[PDB]
C-alpha cells in the first residue's frame, strides 16, 4: 500500500495550505484556511464562490454536507478514517474550519483552540457556518504537547513550535513505511526557541519535510525610520521598557495581535508602568495563563470571568501621563497630543495595507509619535537554513512561500510542488 501526499491548496501563495496524507482507508488533512488573492474581490464566502475562485480546493467527503457542495474531480476512494489538524490559529491556517464536516474530528493543541474561540468571539474572524450563530466556532479536540493521534494506520504527533501564535505546532506523520514532517509556521527567535530546537531533533532524518518559506518571499527593504530593529521577543520587551523609561511624563499606549499572548504576558512582566489591557485581551490572558491584569472595556456589557475591581475606567486612562501603559484599540482621536503609541504587530500590519497610511496620517495630525516595534513570527532566512541543517531532510518540499527555489536542501533532494500534485512515497 502506498502513502500518498497531495498538495490541494496554498501553493505559491502565503495562505490556504491544505495537504492530504493518505494510506489505505485513512487520510488526514492540514491545515484548513483559504487562499487570499488581494486583486480579487468577491461578494461572499459561500463555498461555491470560494471553489469557483480557487480559494479553497475541491475535496471529496470533507466539507459539511449541509452546504450542498457537490465534489467533482479525480478522487475515486472512500475513506473509513478521516481527520483534520490545525497547526495554529492564524487566519491563513484556520479561516474555513466551520466548513469542515462536523462528523470529521479537528485536532489542534488546546491553546490554539482557546485563541481561536477568542479571535472569533464576534464571528468576523472565521467564515460562519450558515447553520449556526455568526460567532459559532466548530468543535476542536484540544491536545497536549507531543500527543499522538492514530487515524487508521496513520500516526500523527503534534509538536509545539516557536511562532508568534501561542499554541503553534508542527506535525510528525508516520505510516508503517514512511516518516514525513509538516513544520507549520515557525521561528528560532521567539519566546520558546527551544521548542523549535526540540522539534528539529524529533524531525531528524525525516523522509519528507514540508516547510514554510515566508521570510525569503519578500526582499529586504530599505530601513523604515519609524521602525526599531528588533532581534527577538525578549529584545522587543527590553525596547518597550527603554521606551517607557525615556518617557516618564507622557501618555504611552500600544497594541499587539491577540494570538501573541506571550508577548502580552511578557510586557505585563517587565513593564515599569502598570499595564492595562482591553477587556477581551485580559480575559484571554486569564484563560490561557491565569494572569490577572487591569483592564478597560471597549464594548458594552461585562465579561463574567474578570474581577470587577481590576477595571479601570476608559476616562481615567485618557487622562494618564505617568502611571499606565495601556492597550489602545480604537477611538485614536482621544489620545493626547504629543503622546507615544507603540505599534507591535497589531493591525494595520504594514504599508501593503491601504489602512496603514490613513492610520499614520491620523496619528501625525495629532502629533502622536508612532513607533513600529515589530518582531516577525517567521524564521529569518538564516534560521530557515539552520532548521534544515538540524533536521537533514532526505527530501525538502518548500511551501507557504513565494520563492520556493530559494529554499535549498544540502542534505538530499528537493521537490517544488504545484497545485494538485501528488507525491507517492
Ligand atoms: Zn502564522
Ligand atoms: Zn502562515
| 391 to 208, 210, 305, 324: CA distances (angstroms) | 11, 12, 43, 45
Q: Say if residue 76 carries a ligand binding annotation.
A: no
Task: Name, in order, each residue with C-beta under 8 angstroms of 265's C-beta and a sequence gap of 6 or more.
Answer: 285, 289, 291
Query: Measured over all CA atoms, what is the biggest interatomic distance in the chain, rounded to whole angstroms?
Result: 70
- 46 assigned ligand-binding residue: no
Q: At what angle do helices 261-270 and 279-289 cross, to 10 degrees?
A: 90
Give the C-alpha separation, 84 to 70, whole Å.
20
Strand order in the sheet with 178-182: 148-151, 154-160, 169-175, 178-182, 208-212, 395-399, 413-414
Domains detected in the chain: 1-221+376-425 (3.60.15.10), 222-375 (3.40.50.10710)
93 annotated as belonging to a binding site for a ligand: yes
Number of CB atoms found within 10 A of residue 22's CB: 23
Query: What CA–CA distance (Å, rounded) separates 212 from 210?
Result: 7
Resolution value, angstrom units: 2.0
Q: Are 179 and 206 in contact (CB under 8 A)?
A: yes
| Ligand 1 ion: residues within 5 Å (CB) | 90, 185
CA distance 232 to 416: 30
Task: Kindly give the pairing relationship between strand 3-9 and strand 18-23.
Answer: antiparallel
How far is Cα 252 from Cα 361, in angstroms, rounded to an integer?
A: 18
Tracing cell 480559494 back to the chain, one arrives at 55
Helix axes 261-270, 233-246, angle to 10 degrees: 40
Secondary structure letter of residue 299 according to DSSP:
S
Which of 219, 119, 227, 113 is CA-nearest to residue 168? 113
Question: Residues within 5 Å of ion ligand 2 by Cβ?
Answer: 92, 185
Closest ligand relative to 217 C-alpha: 2
Alpha helices per DSSP H over 80-175 = 91-94, 110-119
400 is in an annotated binding site: yes
Q: Is 25 flagged in the annotation as binding? A: no
Query: CB-based contacts of 188: which residues, under 8 Å, 6+ apart?
Result: 162, 196, 197, 379, 380, 383, 386, 387
CA distance 261 to 251: 23
Alpha carbon distance 290, 278 (integer Å): 16
For the CA atoms of the chain, what is the radius of gyration?
A: 22
Amino acid at each position: 500500500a502506498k502513502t500518498t501526499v497531495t498538495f490541494h491548496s496554498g501553493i505559491l501563495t502565503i495562505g490556504g495550505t491544505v495537504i492530504e496524507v493518505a494510506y489505505k482507508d485513512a487520510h488526514i488533512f492540514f491545515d484548513f484556511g483559504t487562499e487570499f488573492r488581494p486583486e480579487l474581490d468577491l461578494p461572499d464566502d459561500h463555498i461555491e464562490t470560494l471553489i469557483n475562485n480557487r480559494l479553497v480546493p475541491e475535496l471529496k467527503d470533507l466539507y459539511d454536507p449541509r452546504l450542498g457542495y457537490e465534489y467533482h474531480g479525480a478522487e475515486d476512494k472512500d475513506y473509513q478514517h478521516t481527520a483534520v489538524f490545525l497547526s495554529h490559529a492564524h487566519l491563513d491556517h484556520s479561516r474555513m474550519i466551520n466548513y469542515l464536516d462536523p462528523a470529521v474530528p479537528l485536532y489542534t493543541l488546546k491553546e490554539t483552540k482557546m485563541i481561536l474561540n477568542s479571535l472569533n468571539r464576534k464571528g468576523d474572524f472565521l467564515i460562519p457556518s450558515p447553520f449556526e450563530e455568526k460567532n459559532f466556532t466548530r468543535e476542536m479536540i484540544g491536545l497536549n504537547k507531543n500527543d499522538v493521534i492514530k487515524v487508521g494506520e496513520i500516526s500523527v504527533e503534534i509538536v509545539p513550535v516557536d511562532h508568534d501564535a501561542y499554541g503553534a505546532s508542527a506535525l510528525l506523520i508516520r505510516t508503517p513505511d514512511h516518516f514525513i514532517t509538516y513544520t507549520g509556521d515557525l521561528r528560532l527567535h521567539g519566546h520558546n526557541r527551544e521548542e523549535t530546537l526540540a522539534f528539529c531533533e524529533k524531525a531528524k532524518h525525516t523522509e519528507l519535510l514540508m516547510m514554510e518559506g515566508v521570510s525569503i518571499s519578500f526582499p529586504e527593504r530599505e530601513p523604515d525610520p519609524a521602525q526599531i530593529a528588533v532581534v527577538s521577543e525578549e529584545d522587543l520587551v527590553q525596547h518597550l521598557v527603554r521606551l517607557e523609561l525615556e518617557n516618564p511624563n507622557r501618555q504611552i499606549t500600544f497594541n499587539g495581535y491577540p494570538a501573541n499572548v506571550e508577548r502580552f504576558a511578557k510586557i505585563i512582566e517587565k513593564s515599569p508602568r502598570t499595564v492595562v489591557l482591553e477587556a477581551n485581551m485580559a480575559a484571554l490572558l486569564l484563560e490561557v495563563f491565569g494572569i490577572e491584569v487591569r483592564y478597560y472595556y471597549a464594548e458594552s456589557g461585562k465579561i463574567p470571568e474578570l474581577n470587577p475591581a481590576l477595571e479601570i475606567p476608559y476616562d481615567t486612562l485618557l487622562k494618564d501621563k505617568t502611571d499606565y501603559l495601556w492597550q489602545v484599540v480604537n477611538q485614536f482621536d482621544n489620545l493626547q497630543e504629543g503622546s507615544l503609541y507603540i505599534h507591535s504587530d497589531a493591525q494595520p500590519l504594514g504599508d501593503f495595507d491601504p489602512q496603514y497610511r490613513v492610520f499614520l496620517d491620523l496619528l501625525a495630525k495629532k502629533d502622536i509619535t508612532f513607533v513600529r516595534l515589530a518582531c516577525s513570527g517567521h524564521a529569518i532566512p538564516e534560521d530557515l537554513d539552520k532548521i534544515i541543517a538540524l533536521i537533514e531532510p532526505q527530501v525538502l518540499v518548500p511551501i507557504h512561500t513565494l520563492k520556493p527555489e530559494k529554499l535549498e536542501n544540502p542534505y538530499g533532494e528537493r521537490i517544488l510542488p504545484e497545485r494538485g500534485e501528488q507525491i507517492v512515497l
